[model samples]
Target chain A: NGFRLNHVPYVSQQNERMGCWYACTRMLGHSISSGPRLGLPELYDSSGPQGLQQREDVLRLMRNENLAEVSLPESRQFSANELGNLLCRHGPIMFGWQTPAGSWHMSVLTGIDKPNDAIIFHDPQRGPDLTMPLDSFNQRLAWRVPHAMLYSEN
Target chain B: NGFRLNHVPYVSQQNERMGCWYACTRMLGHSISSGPRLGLPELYDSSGPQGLQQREDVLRLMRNENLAEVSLPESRQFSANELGNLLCRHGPIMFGWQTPAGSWHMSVLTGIDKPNDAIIFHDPQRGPDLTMPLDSFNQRLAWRVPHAMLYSEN
Candidate 1:
């Protein structure tokens, strides 16, 4: 019982396509729609065609938020055990990886279940909050941070 | 308290594009995964590049599910009142509209809030449930069924 815990934050739904980034912000109890003092990009743009938010639009957002600051490159990466420890210490982290079918995806690691040997993550594709073994993430994830990684700075 | 209700079903998320139809079916309390009784085509084709689903693919799906019998062409159409009544009675209707700003969109109408004079529709672009005036839908909607309209039987 002590080995299991949750660090997942408050979260809600994403718009049909581009709201993944904004949804992440909301779950973390932050907002992209802010005053000038925050220096955040307008996280949402209505005129961006359906389901396609420009890559630059969201990447720029991560910079303003100070969330992506070890976070990894493809060749050199953290193992699940390594990242899970970081998650417990620093809070949930964002991971960008490729699906087996080859679609790029982003999900949040909330915490780990040491006794069960599983990791907890919020899979944007399937709604937040899912659990799977360490090996599953190890095998499925690409060894790189596709954009600015959120939750680092040490 | 008496004149309000929601027929909209539980829903799932779609990809950045190409999942509005499946999302609609799921929200209407049906599965995109169906049995052999219906002669429906597997309407969602994932391998066909991105952001492009044929209009006919979904339309055929509607026919198999006994939801659509409208014989409207791209030019001819149904009036909002006509469609609205049909929507409340037969169940929620999915409408595909062209934005004056030049984009394609899909949304679902669950039922009418008669006392409030509003229509309840799930704008996949927004949340699964939202309410707007009958007049707004009347003014904005172009009204020839644009894509696959699911969930019907008469």
Candidate 2:
């Protein structure tokens, strides 16, 4: 038998916007042929504290699931253990941060390297992106609108 | 400029349960190239007092809008002016109800016919379905879900 991998990529910047769309498209491509028509633009460029509003609208229309409150970026500060536990429960999460160069980048929270106090991410633009001092990651990248999706598999 | 109408029919015991999925599939078919895939099952059914939970969940995921706590079986309790204001603010709504025969049906509330105390709806299975004594409609179909899309015009 085969298994499914549910990966939720983060969309923090305009450049990385396509990644979210790509992920949804690829996933929808595999399942649900006649139920709903999956669209890329529907899933792209949707990030921020209020960004989830658009997503909620689409999900309701899609009749996928009911709505849930989105936690603000400022509220996402968590210890490594806490973060890991949250990720484990909700699947991948989309977090935003200001890059060293002062631009914004959104990436997925893949896992935490607890020993080094770092969080590992599978970045769409720059694969396998890592940041040390979970605090810095939260301070810089987790300050915008952060949301998560629970997929059937991941 | 031209447009086409596509329709699908669903029969269920609970009005809002099937209606939510029907409206979503219709909207997605009209908006995005690819529709949405199934996410998770609702924790509750769609006919009871808590049935609104399903509608609330849809709004949270797609629109990020939290619904205010309200009682169920709410008919035209809101005055005509109030209903008009809500429709203007939120756009169209999908409502479902049970028939005397115990079969459930859903329709899109497109307009209010004040003279007849009836609501105009776009029903997929039955075209241009209108229900009078709005309260009766609510008893038969207790839940209403709202959705919007930018590409809806396309």
Candidate 3:
């Protein structure tokens, strides 16, 4: 019964395909026409660190005032499990992951931290980012300039 | 891969077990550890116009940065769908909904609004309140309740 951001492929072959912004906006329930169209060049670019950072900035700006956004200091060394739990407990953390097919996937952490050292995430391709080991995570996925954000409206 | 809240009950049991404070904290990814919580008293009491107006009061405090307790106005009329869209789009709105079984459940709106007039919600019972219609909503899920506090760490 949870709503989700529609997933778009890193590369799309079809004209109707969407990307991250479309997915995030859909998940958050904004009218595609409300403020500004989400898929504009400035909105969904994932080119590099600047793109990632800008994405985070835009999301934070769009956060509702009623909900509080808590920022956590950067931690140098964290187990994959710990990192996943932290992200799950906080809100959504932007990070990288590896798929069973050996492709790297960028996704959003979506669930609560579990005691078993597993974390849930939202992948555009795969449905829910299910529980994966911290060790395997670090080995399989490389988190490049990772960052986190929480969304709430209360 | 999203995290799910474990403590919330299914929709049918929410009113009897869950309420606003729980909904708010859960929506913000915070856990509830103390008792004499927010919903019990409000649910049992049938006070005049002021019934659950405290939720709106809390939102106003957040808007004004005032910590003192105050009462605010209830939204005249809103369908669960509209409230859900408002929360997801704007942050969080205080509101209530009827479960699939016709029970009242209080929770926060999470994901974006989708087609078919449904909006996603964050329910304690179910991790994500799936797309539900405006007709599904009931009561004011007030925002900025005095009972809830926000803080920032530099």
TM-scores, all candidates, are: 0.37, 0.32, 0.33
Best by DockQ: 3
Candidate 2 local Cα displacement, residue A90, angstroms: 2.4
Query: Candidates ranked by DockQ, best first?
Result: 3, 2, 1
Candidate 3 whole-model C-alpha lDDT, 0 to 1: 0.41
Candidate 1 true-interface contact recovery: 0.00
Compute the lDDT for candidate 1.
0.51
Give the best candidate by TM-score: 1
Please state every model's RMSD to the true fold in angstroms: 21.6, 18.6, 12.7
Of the pair 1 and 3, which is ahead by lDDT? 1
Backbone clashes for every candidate come to 3, 28, 32
Model 3 CA deviation exceeding 4 Å by range: A1-8, A11-154, B1-20, B32-45, B48-85, B88-94, B98-104, B138-154
lDDT of 2 at A146: 25
**CAPRI-style quality class for the chain A–B interface of candidate 3:** incorrect
DockQ of each: 0.01, 0.01, 0.08
- lDDT: which candidate is best? 1
Question: Between prediction 1 and prediction 3, which has the larger TM-score?
Answer: 1
Across A1-154, the per-residue lDDT of candidate 3 in tens digits comes to 1222233222211233335433443443333433223333333334666566556655555563222333433543354334433433334544444456754444555543435554555655545545565455555444332222334442
Q: Could you give candidate 2's per-residue lDDT for residues B33-148 as a string of tens digits?
A: 22123321232224464446655555454443222222332342544434433433333454445557765544555445556665555665655444456566544543443222
Q: Give residue A133's error in model 3 in angstroms.
A: 29
